[PDB]
Amino acid sequence: HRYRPGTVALREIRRYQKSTELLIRKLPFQRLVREIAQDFKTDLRFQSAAIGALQEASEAYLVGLFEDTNLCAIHAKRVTIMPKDIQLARRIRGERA
Amino acid sequence: HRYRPGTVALREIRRYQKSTELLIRKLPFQRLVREIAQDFKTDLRFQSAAIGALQEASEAYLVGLFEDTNLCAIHAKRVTIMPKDIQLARRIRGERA
Amino acid sequence: KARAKAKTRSSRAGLQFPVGRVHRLLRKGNYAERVGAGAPVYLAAVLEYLTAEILELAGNAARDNKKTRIIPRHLQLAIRNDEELNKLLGKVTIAQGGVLPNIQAVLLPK
Amino acid sequence: LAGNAARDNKKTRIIPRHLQLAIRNDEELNKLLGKVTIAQGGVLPNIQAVLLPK
Amino acid sequence: SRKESYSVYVYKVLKQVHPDTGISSKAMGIMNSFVNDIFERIAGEASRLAHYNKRSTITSREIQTAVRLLLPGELAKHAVSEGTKAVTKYTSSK
Amino acid sequence: SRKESYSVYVYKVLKQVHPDTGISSKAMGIMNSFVNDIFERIAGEASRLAHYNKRSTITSREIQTAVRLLLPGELAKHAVSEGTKAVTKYTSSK
Amino acid sequence: KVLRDNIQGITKPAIRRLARRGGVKRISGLIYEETRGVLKVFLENVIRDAVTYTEHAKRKTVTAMDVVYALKRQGRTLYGFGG
Amino acid sequence: KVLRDNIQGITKPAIRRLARRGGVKRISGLIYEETRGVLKVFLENVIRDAVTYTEHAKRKTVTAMDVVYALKRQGRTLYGFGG
DNA sequence: GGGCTGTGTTTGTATCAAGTTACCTGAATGGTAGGTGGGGAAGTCCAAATATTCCTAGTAAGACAATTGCATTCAAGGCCTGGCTGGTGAAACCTGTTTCCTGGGAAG
Ligand SMILES: [Mg+2]
Numbered sequence: 168h169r170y171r172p173g174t175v176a177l178r179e180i181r182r183y184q185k186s187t188e189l190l191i192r193k194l195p196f197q198r199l200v201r202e203i204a205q206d207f208k209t210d211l212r213f214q215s216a217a218i219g220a221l222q223e224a225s226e227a228y229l230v231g232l233f234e235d236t237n238l239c240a241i242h243a244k245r246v247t248i249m250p251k252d253i254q255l256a257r258r259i260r261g262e263r264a
Numbered sequence: 265h266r267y268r269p270g271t272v273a274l275r276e277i278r279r280y281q282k283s284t285e286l287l288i289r290k291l292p293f294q295r296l297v298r299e300i301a302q303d304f305k306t307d308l309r310f311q312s313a314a315i316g317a318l319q320e321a322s323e324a325y326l327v328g329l330f331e332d333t334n335l336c337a338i339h340a341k342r343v344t345i346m347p348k349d350i351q352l353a354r355r356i357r358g359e360r361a
Numbered sequence: 362k363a364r365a366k367a368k369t370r371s372s373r374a375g376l377q378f379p380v381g382r383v384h385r386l387l388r389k390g391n392y393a394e395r396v397g398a399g400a401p402v403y404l405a406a407v408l409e410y411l412t413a414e415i416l417e418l419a420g421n422a423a424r425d426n427k428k429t430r431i432i433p434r435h436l437q438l439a440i441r442n443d444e445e446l447n448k449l450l451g452k453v454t455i456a457q458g459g460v461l462p463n464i465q466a467v468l469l470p471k
Numbered sequence: 472l473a474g475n476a477a478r479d480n481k482k483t484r485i486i487p488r489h490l491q492l493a494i495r496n497d498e499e500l501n502k503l504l505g506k507v508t509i510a511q512g513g514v515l516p517n518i519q520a521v522l523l524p525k
Numbered sequence: 526s527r528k529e530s531y532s533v534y535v536y537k538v539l540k541q542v543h544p545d546t547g548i549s550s551k552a553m554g555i556m557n558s559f560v561n562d563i564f565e566r567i568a569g570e571a572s573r574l575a576h577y578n579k580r581s582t583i584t585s586r587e588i589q590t591a592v593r594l595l596l597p598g599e600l601a602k603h604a605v606s607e608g609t610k611a612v613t614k615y616t617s618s619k
Numbered sequence: 620s621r622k623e624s625y626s627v628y629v630y631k632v633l634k635q636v637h638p639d640t641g642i643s644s645k646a647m648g649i650m651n652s653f654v655n656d657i658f659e660r661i662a663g664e665a666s667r668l669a670h671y672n673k674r675s676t677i678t679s680r681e682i683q684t685a686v687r688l689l690l691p692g693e694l695a696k697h698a699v700s701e702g703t704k705a706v707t708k709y710t711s712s713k
Numbered sequence: 714k715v716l717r718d719n720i721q722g723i724t725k726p727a728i729r730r731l732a733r734r735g736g737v738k739r740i741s742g743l744i745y746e747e748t749r750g751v752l753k754v755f756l757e758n759v760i761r762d763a764v765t766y767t768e769h770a771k772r773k774t775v776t777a778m779d780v781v782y783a784l785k786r787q788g789r790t791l792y793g794f795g796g
Numbered sequence: 797k798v799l800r801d802n803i804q805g806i807t808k809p810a811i812r813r814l815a816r817r818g819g820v821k822r823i824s825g826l827i828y829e830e831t832r833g834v835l836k837v838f839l840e841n842v843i844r845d846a847v848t849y850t851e852h853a854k855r856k857t858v859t860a861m862d863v864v865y866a867l868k869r870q871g872r873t874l875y876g877f878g879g
Numbered sequence: 880g881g882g883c884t885g886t887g888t889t890t891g892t893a894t895c896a897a898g899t900t901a902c903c904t905g906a907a908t909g910g911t912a913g914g915t916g917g918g919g920a921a922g923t924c925c926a927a928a929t930a931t932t933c934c935t936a937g938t939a940a941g942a943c944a945a946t947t948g949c950a951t952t953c954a955a956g957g958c959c960t961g962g963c964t965g966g967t968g969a970a971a972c973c974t975g976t977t978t979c980c981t982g983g984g985a986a987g
Binding site: 173176177179180182183184190191192195196198199200201202203204205207208210211212213214216217219220221223224225226227228229230231232233234236237240246247248249250253254257263 | 714715716717719720722723724727728730731732733734735736737738739740741743744746747748751752753754755756757759760761763764765767768773774775776777779780781784789791793794
């Protein structure tokens, strides 16, 4: 009937750790590259295997970030991640100077 | 007269962040390498600039570890580091599999 | 005139990865100026042991989930199941894989 | 930058501590050598301002 | 034109330990690009082993040290002995 | 025998922006080994730029791209324009 | 061509779904303004390294091996697209 | 040559003094059995990579550039000793 | 006691790949001659490792004091979940254009 909080959530963890699908969709990630590329050189083309080389590398970083974020949230006797965790996750690896 | 706890401690932080001295002494670190080298090849010699290349690289790692340990101890509303911090410090960087 | 039977150097060493193709990828990659005759033999073997060891482990995960062909999820999951294969590819993303199933056993429901 | 830190601490010659401290004082010089240990340097003076005494 | 590859030489290894097994196209390219990457790690560490010992020569000794560096633990015990079989078999021939 | 170095060419730069400044022995070796490392990053990325575009030639264009990769942000704006002065001065001579 | 408000294209569930792949049960509402920041840092250190390859060969199309060469540079190798 | 009990050579103040360089005020008494463990992990991934260079040139002395080449391999560069 | 979502089993076809080959060229091999690089054996000298003591400094320890860390309780806020609406994303279709894409070619 009424699920408790943390039950539909844990169904999602075993769901998405099994599939191989695209989580960030294509066109709202393709247009993100058409903002950062405009600075360094206007009028560039992209092969769709290179955009997909980013959509499987940006999703390779956040999942590598959030799984190292959630270590901190558990570490502070919590089960909730917070933006003080990520900003201290990245300072340990040296991914932000 | 009687210092409070945290006063002689904070004198040490501004002391050792100023000097360039050796903290781990030479011979109780030189003999540490004569335990790990015995497995891979017995009867090896070491140049003293190579042992010192380790004494300034092992002290380059723990200080890089403890300064990233103390971020976690402050993060759990504490001022004390604990061995649950280091074992979660290293899991974030990927320095232990 | 004719000549003798051309026996390939991959069949003269008992390997499957070529040695003729590896030996022109050590003289057109500017790795060094001289490349020994035994070096692309020895390197095509190490390319052949490590190509088995993934596909040995990629065969099992295909079988354990009732599959004929190995899709990249199995390559994602054959890696990071083995310990020493993971420490080689510790920095490496495999495309279209997702991650291993993992919960930290604190988020379990109450 | 290694000349300035030698001057600000009243030194004629540049010892590696100054090279340690000229790096990681500048931001963009640090992002080049972010992985790099400099020998015989120690670290910058740093407290997280929570360990200050009470 | 011609794209050289290692795709053919996978079927000659896939049909050695799993003879009733196919492999998809997009999984070939991983085992294709696994090879080209693990090629130039071993070569590109044997290359930098040539400069460190002042020789212009990549021997078959230098590939052995550039496999005992990249492969950890138990792969470094097998892939060494899975090469020195394929050399001793090679040199006794010809 | 002979150990080539960049130690002499530091005093010809140290005495350009701080003419009343010495430098120690063990700090020379850092700026010595800073050079040899930042040499082979730029060369060893210009080298791998030769294979990626199928040329056997390291031009002075390829060193410019292998400095806009290794140097971040504001160093990549100066060290490009601090090279093209030293080339245009060089080529107008001779 | 200019299309703005597309750092806001990384929607609120699609960061939650990425959080679920990392093994995260409960999240805050202030990760969404942190993730979009850390993402655009990572794409301003790949596209900045990718375009200098594509400009160097005087190509107008940043091809598939270009991005892989950029990710080769940072030490995060991507298999499956070549290179 | 064998000399044991020298992971216990990293003494109790010399881990505290390393803790003070990191900016740490108060420590536990159970870091001492953690630090000696994390230290010997780091020296079983450098000496294992250093000796394979020294054996490769058939030298009996692990020289100064050898360790720097090992630290080059892991991605933790050490300046000041060459290399 | 009941329910929901995940899971499984069976069928058909489309698609993807497996198959075999045709050629044709690219490349892969065979036989050779040449030089060079490296490998090997040596030696004086070189750098490190040891045996020692000596002294000293900080290491180790025992005691004490006070803060912090922990565990509980309190209070509520924040977030998760779901019933709903709709705007866009994606998949399928069509193309002209643009760029490449080596490759060859001309001309200064
Ligand atoms: Mg004319």
